Amino acid sequence: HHSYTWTGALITPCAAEESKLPINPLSNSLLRHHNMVYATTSRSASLRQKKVTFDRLQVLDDHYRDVLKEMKAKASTVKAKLLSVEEACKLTPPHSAKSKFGYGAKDVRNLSSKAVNHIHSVWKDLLEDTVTPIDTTIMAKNEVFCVQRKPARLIVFPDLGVRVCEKMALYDVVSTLPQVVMGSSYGFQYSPGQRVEFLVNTWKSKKNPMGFSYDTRCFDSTVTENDIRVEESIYQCCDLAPEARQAIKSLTERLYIGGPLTNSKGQNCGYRRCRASGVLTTSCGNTLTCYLKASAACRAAKLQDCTMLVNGDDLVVICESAGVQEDAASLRAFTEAMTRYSAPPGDPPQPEYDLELITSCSSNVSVAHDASGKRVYYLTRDPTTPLARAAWETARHTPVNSWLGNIIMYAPTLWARMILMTHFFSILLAQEQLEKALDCQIYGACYSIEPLDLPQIIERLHGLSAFSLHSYSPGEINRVASCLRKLGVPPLRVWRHRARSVRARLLSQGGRAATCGKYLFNWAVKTKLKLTPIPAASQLDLSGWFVAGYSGGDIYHSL
């Protein structure tokens, strides 16, 4: 019952891999301690192979099926549509992996005869054959990190044409079903502001609250054949088209339950009998399965009035405290129940009695005050990885503009404001590329964002508060200042002076650039300005952004 089977054929790269941090003329103005930033190469694969390969034992009790019965009752109310070849195509990222059958993401998007005809052929094959496994490619992910070295994380994905077909059958399912099944617990519906709003309102809803995060070790590898089959039965509860029922049935048996692994060179690396990293249903499946096992463990553990938040594999449980000795006991029962459902933790879960001490998705809640002195809750994180990736992106132009994702995800934070905005606007001005749109991958999907749109984007994701925050927690300020010392990043005082300049430079540019100057760098001035909401913000079409998450989803959005 192993998560993976292997042959001995190595996981081979598709290109040349740079491990050591590239050095520009701009590099030293951001990060001086270069020997601390590295990128994971395919050389590291053999170590992840070991970690992600283990046997899984599942013991399903009455709490599991009781919760499943309920999830299916909600699922039965969902009606989902079969996406047109044209709709799924228009949802393909432009720099998505090409097909082995002579067409690319650009071909797919422009609706080329060659591309359209193959998608039609793969779809037909899906409807006629429900048993032949579908091949997948195994790739080592080249991600940037800081010291104190991780091995290369792995991505399993099917051919371009299968990804278009997954979208036709399940894009509407993954979009509408999880909120119906999980309610306010489906994390992927919330904008960062909506999420902080949810946790606080939830933390407050409890007379005496206790919360904890639960992180399963290699969650993808803990997902079993029953788990994947159980998810299919949730999808099949929807009112679907017969063509969608068959295609979902086919994709499950032939791709989702598992299949063979192949490298870039095309050698059989082995077999997968667990969750694929690069399938549409990764984010959605992991959310439903994590919620199902967690909900059932709460019952098992007898946790009092538990509200939870599920985001893929990241889980947070906020419940009514029964007492410190009781909560800590209840927690070990939760872990024991979880373990039985084949989802044990990496490090054990700790009960927390302060919302600001729970960490999930590498983030935690913090406080600052808006212009009028009012306490404002925002999500923050340790700036170490965002800053090390920003240093990598200072010298190398990447398909993922980590820093732009970071600015969009963490606009109200001290560090995103003072360092990421300041540094990258300085670069954009120098290169005259403020108006040049950038594809940026955020925790799944790909977004085409024009930097000039950051003020209006931020206002709709965080509010005007983000441009007015001050009086940050000392704990936050110290986490940031220690990180800057660790990485050799100039002190925050240096960034306020540079920001005054970038601000002045943006204002002298007029229009949208001056709107970027006025709003993003208003913290830098002593003689502040009282900001108003931006007219263009309400006119931005953010439909389909936060309806759901799409891990290996291969989903694209534009403005």
Ligand SMILES: CNC(=O)c1c(-c2ccc(F)cc2)oc2cc(N(C)S(C)(=O)=O)c(-c3ccc4c(n3)-c3cc5c(F)cccc5n3CO4)cc12
């Ligand atoms: C179960 N755990 C949680 O729900 C999260 C917790 C938490 C839970 C309990 C706690 F006590 C303390 C923290 O913090 C999170 C931070 C998160 N960010 C990284 S952020 C600050 O919102 O941008 C996310 C998250 C996950 C997936 C996403 C996004 N965000 C996200 C933002 C985003 C965007 F701004 C534009 C476009 C796409 C976007 N996505 C697409 O996918 C989830 C969580």
